[PDB]
Subunit: 223 residues, 2 copies
């Protein structure tokens, strides 16, 4: 039934599903120093809203809960990262983790990933990434990050998102050549977001459990 | 940059490296990694020659060429392996005389996880019926794209050039698919499917990089620079 939405209906649904921007849980009256504790706590709170968002991506909830959890397990860090890059676009050289937690690169192994995220924000700024495009990209990360590491339904939803992205670019006046060129440009940034998630995962080990994710998904009560 | 799509395909097909063999030290679990390392080392030399023939690559500085190869070489080995393996379900065709199944990939801690990811990519290629012309385009995208987000006025010019070459490879992939008779819808859908596989190949390369370091092991910047930094005396 979700595969029957029009491109405009798909965009509207994704825009409406957007999660809120959360704040860091630091007392702004106290001394600043604890950064990883604040960032970890923010990420933990941002996961619940991510799950609520995922449940509104058309087609996601037609999957079994087991497969929903596996997609979230694969995608959650990439999704946190692309959200961070999106909100940092208009803050050259800085990362807007929260509206009260804007850090620059001067604030072991952290700067390497900080620089990669700053480079993604700058690429988004160079391409003039639109909000409608960003929500489609985030939905593609959710469905594609865990699809090879477990499928037909996932691929049909991914195809619908590609159609929606192309529709947005055609509506913006791009030529057919510019549409395919921009689609490729946006999807190649996803490979860099995967790379960052991989390197970020290494840095953090230097993971939300299946049960935690399943609990956040709040299963229906008639099994 | 002025090549047509047809000329791009032709240049990429002509640049393709040869399929190398393993030595004919009999094969055993104990000798496996030595055999695979020796093969990869020989493939890397041909990979350098191939890269210099990818349109637009040698227009970049030496330093940037090295950086792009440093970031891409394992992905390139892997996608080559997945392509060689596409017609052999359940097996990885490292060489025509070195065709392994995943039970052979269990002797080393952490190998079977990567082996399975590679088999899954091979299966995906097969389900998509990936064409040879599409493959060489994807391999060229990996070369130009994997390191472009990890690099001055010269750097800005290099990045603009890389993105222009990437755009012409996109145009080439679309041309191939149009020529194959796909609708415009099917063309953008297949372009997206192909490019999303590159995210999985990046993931496999990062996991592979961790596995290689767990064992002992990469081409140094200086080694890659030595092979790329050729003289003109031959
Ligand atoms: C209860 C189960 C355990 N939990 C479950 C979930 C797990 C959470 C681990 C965790 C801890 C911290 C981050 C932040 C963070 C926070 C919010 C954001 O939106 C984005 C980010 C981006 C990010 C990922 C790179 N990050 C860093 O700090 C960082 C930024 C630049 C350079 C180096 C590091 C994300 C994720 C811990
Ligand atoms: C001083 C210079 C040092 N050299 C520089 C170059 C470096 C070479 C390290 C090196 C050693 C071995 C591989 C093989 C290999 C060989 C050929 C192929 O086409 C592809 C592959 C694929 C690959 C990377 C995953 N692999 C494995 O074994 C493997 C396969 C499945 C699961 C787990 C592991 C590649 C690369 C060492």
């Amino acid at each position: 039934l979700a595969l029957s939405l029009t491109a405009d209906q798909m965009v509207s649904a994704l825009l409406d599903a957007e999660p809120p921007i959360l704040y860091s849980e630091y007392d702004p009256t106290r001394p600043f120093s604890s950064m990883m504790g604040l960032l970890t706590n923010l990420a933990d709170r941002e996961l619940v809203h991510m799950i609520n968002w995922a449940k509104r991506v058309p087609g996601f909830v037609d999957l079994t809960l087991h497969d929903q959890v596996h997609l979230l397990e694969s995608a959650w860090l990439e999704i946190l990262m692309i959200g961070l890059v999106w909100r940092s676009m208009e803050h050259p050289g800085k990362l807007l983790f929260a509206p009260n937690l804007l850090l620059d690169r001067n604030q072991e192994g952290m700067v390497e990933i900080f620089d990669m995220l700053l480079a993604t924000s700058s690429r988004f700024r160079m391409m003039n990434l639109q909000g409608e495009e960003f929500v489609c990209l985030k939905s593609i990360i959710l469905l594609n990050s865990g699809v090879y590491t477990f499928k037909d339904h996932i691929h049909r939803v991914l195809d619908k998102i590609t159609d929606t992205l192309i529709h947005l670019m055609a509506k913006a006046g791009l030529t057919l050549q510019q549409q395919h060129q921009r689609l490729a440009q946006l999807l190649l940034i996803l490979s860099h977001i995967r790379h960052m998630s991989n390197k970020g995962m290494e840095h953090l080990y230097s993971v939300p459990s299946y049960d935690l994710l399943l609990e956040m998904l709040d299963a229906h009560r008639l099994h």
